[PDB]
């Protein structure tokens, strides 16, 4: 009887939302429907372009029901407030969406409540002003959840999907596969944070006050994550956006999507996560995430930068290129805070910087660099990452690099952190080594025959090559 | 140094309406003054305009209905950071 999507997000061990409010920007809604009656408040804010009745409020009713419906909702308690920014044909404007986001902020200033979650079940093309407004509303302290987009495309070309500091959510089906319908389907790429059930989701139907329908979209998928976020913030009201995003990642089912569905270049950039509620078991724990930069472009002096959240520490830095035309990476300070910067080679099409960003309170971290000598440095407390960069065109707590290269070591003073180094080499397009259960991958690098790059995939270190050896640094309390 | 931007997906564009975005620290009193300035310099040239909304709270700025002809003029107003042409968003 339990709908598949609700079972899918139930943790392997288990036992909300009332202190949290969830704003919805959608079509009008049938707020008398028994799934949501007494739970959604229509603001009657409205800003929609003109058209070019049970169909006018179908989309929004279903989503209100997915977040909060009493039979089929994710966070069955939660209060919702609803703004109308989509017309009867499902269309709206950037301008109107801007004024909605401004309206939610003005209401909060006028009558403050608790944590606020804003669901944005819409997209258009990349928009500078819409992305800036989301970023700004995020820095004021509001959590934004956004659809990845439905065009089987790189999500970074759409808004608010690509916006910084928004949680962007793609859709999977009952087989944990990316939704695909012809040349349509869930967007993907490095601007997607995670996936959630988004195919055949039963929810409130505006056909009658007690009816139910199955809809599919990335909106349905973002609605599961908004509801999960609301219950997470009801239990730990004080979470920062870094701390909430690190938990959504940690409690996701992992390596369950079949990456074959994605175009080849996007498998490395797309997180293999399907969202899930946190269990009953939850003690401090070391959370880390991997952050891929924008591609650097092909200018000869190009660099890509990868940054962490202000309350995260950069514990390691690596880089990747599809051609292997690459001059490595290095950690550099910036506004008093370390970032991860990768360098293109002359003639390469560009590189990615790949940061490992962790929540490590009480941590004093530094960088130890040795210019070319082979080359070595060490932490004279715990080594969390090794990086290396060179300026030539071609060839213990200790990092070791090529003789012609600079070698950089990330050293952190963390009382209560235990760390260990695990190795694995073989004769091979890809070589792999993983941290033991209960440890966190903090750094991933290849030993110095020609490598494309290295990246942390969850707790596995992946090295990509054209005796190649992968090196993982793993830490716990 | 002010720049202009519009949707790369040509069917999703909505020409004739523009979000004028002003520099971060600009105050609501300045935003409203820059709008009336735009309207006045446009009318001097024979263009009707319509200020649909004045943003303050997240981004300062305003929403104007006007012909695209004025974009080189509007780009030169004080406090302007950049200007973006309105476009469509869709239920996902």
């Amino acid at each position: 009887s339990i709908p598949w999507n609700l079972e899918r997000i139930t943790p392997p061990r288990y036992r909300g939302g009332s202190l949290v409010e969830v704003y919805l920007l959608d079509t009008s809604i049938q707020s008398d429907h028994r799934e949501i009656e007494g739970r959604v408040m229509v603001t009657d804010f409205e800003n929609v372009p003109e058209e070019d009745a049970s169909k006018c409020d179908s989309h929004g009713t279903h989503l209100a029901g997915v977040v909060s419906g009493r039979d089929a909702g994710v966070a069955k308690g939660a209060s919702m407030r609803s703004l109308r920014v989509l017309n009867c044909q499902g269309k709206g404007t950037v301008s109107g969406t801007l004024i909605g986001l401004e309206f939610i902020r003005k209401s909060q200033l006028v009558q403050p409540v608790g944590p606020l979650v804003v669901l944005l079940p819409l997209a258009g093309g990349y928009s500078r002003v819409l992305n800036a407004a989301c970023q700004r509303l995020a820095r004021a302290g509001v959590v934004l959840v956004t659809a990845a987009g439905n065009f089987r495309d790189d999500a970074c070309l759409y808004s608010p999907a690509s916006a910084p500091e928004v949680i962007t959510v793609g859709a999977t089906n009952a087989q944990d596969q990316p939704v695909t319908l012809g040349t349509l389907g869930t967007n993907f790429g490095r601007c997607v944070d995670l996936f959630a059930p988004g195919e055949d989701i039963i929810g409130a139907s505006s056909d009658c006050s007690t009816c139910f329908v199955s809809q599919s979209g990335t909106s349905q998928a973002a609605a599961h994550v908004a509801g999960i976020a609301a219950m997470m913030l009801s239990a730990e009201p004080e979470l920062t956006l870094a701390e909430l995003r690190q938990r959504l990642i940690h409690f996701s089912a992992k390596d369950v999507i079949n990456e074959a569905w994605f175009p080849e270049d996007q498998r490395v950039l797309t997180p293999n996560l399907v969202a899930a509620l946190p269990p009953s078991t939850h003690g401090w724990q070391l959370f880390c995430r991997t952050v891929w930069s924008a591609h650097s472009g092909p200018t000869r002096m190009a660099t890509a930068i990868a940054r962490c959240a202000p309350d995260e520490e950069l514990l390691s830095c690596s880089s990747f290129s599809r051609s292997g035309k690459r001059r490595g990476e290095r950690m550099e300070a910036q506004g008093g805070k370390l970032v991860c910067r990768a360098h293109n080679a002359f003639g390469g099409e560009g590189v990615y910087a790949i940061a490992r960003c962790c929540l490590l309170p009480q941590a004093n971290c530094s960088v130890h660099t040795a210019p070319p000598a082979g080359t070595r440095v060490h932490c004279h407390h715990v080594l969390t990452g090794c990086s290396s960069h060179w300026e030539v065109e071609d060839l213990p707590n200790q990092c070791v690099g090529h003789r012609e290269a600079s070698i950089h070591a990330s050293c952190c003073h963390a009382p209560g952190l235990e760390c260990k180094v695990k190795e694995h080499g073989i004769p091979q397009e890809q070589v792999t080594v993983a941290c033991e259960e209960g440890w966190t991958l903090t750094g991933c690098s290849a030993l110095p025959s020609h490598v494309l790059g290295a990246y942390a995939v969850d707790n596995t270190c992946v090295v990509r090559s054209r005796a190649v050896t992968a090196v993982a640094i793993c830490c716990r309390s | 140094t002010a720049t202009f931007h519009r949707c790369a997906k040509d069917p999703w564009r909505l020409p004739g309406t523009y979000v004028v975005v002003l520099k971060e620290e600009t105050h609501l009193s300045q935003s409203e003054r820059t709008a009336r300035r735009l309207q006045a310099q446009a009318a001097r040239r024979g263009y009707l305009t319509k200020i649909l909304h004045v943003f303050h709270g997240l981004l300062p700025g305003f929403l104007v209905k006007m012909s695209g002809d004025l974009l080189e003029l509007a780009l030169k107003l004080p406090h302007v950071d950049y200007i973006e042409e309105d476009s469509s968003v869709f239920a996902q």
Partner: peptide
């Protein structure tokens, strides 16, 4: 898949 969701029939 319903037409209320863009870009489905």
């Amino acid at each position: 898949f319903v037409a209320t969701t863009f870009a489905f029939x």
